[PDB]
Amino acid sequence: GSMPTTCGFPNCKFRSRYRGLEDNRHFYRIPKRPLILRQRWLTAIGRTEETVVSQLRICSAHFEGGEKKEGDIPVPDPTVDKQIKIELPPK
Ligand SMILES: [Zn+2]
């Protein structure tokens, strides 16, 4: 990305956890597949669908493992909170 990316968390304690170097972490866009995963992604940020996706992005630091696939929802703190993940129906 060319623009200084700000994630859409109500309180990103991760880019603030760093001091001058946010690791330039992979800024994830909210998945659209599956749809229920996209829906779940809004839960982490406490946002709605008309209030998300456009500008809102998510730091890879909001994941236990830093990996977004198709069943991984962001969390406020993987080291404290409950990493929200889902079991996507196989095919
Ligand atoms: Zn963040």
**Could you state, in order of their start, the residue ranges of all structural domains in the chain?**
1-91
For residue 64, is it left (φ>0), alpha (ψ between -120 and 50) or beta?
beta
- Ligand 1 is an ion; residues with CB less than 5 A from it: 7, 9, 12, 14, 59
Q: What is the distance in A from the centroid of ligand 1 to the CA of 62?
A: 6
Identify the bridge partners of residue 85 per DSSP, sorted by sequence position. 72
- Count CB neighbours of 26 within 10 A: 16
DSSP state of 38: H
What are 53's two structure tokens? 């996706």
Q: What is the distance in A from the centroid of ligand 1 to the CA of 25?
A: 9
**Helical segments of the chain, H only:** 35-45
Output the CA angle 81-61-71, nearest 5 degrees: 70
Q: What is the distance in A from the centroid of ligand 1 to the CA of 91?
A: 31
Q: Indicate which technique resolved this structure.
A: NMR
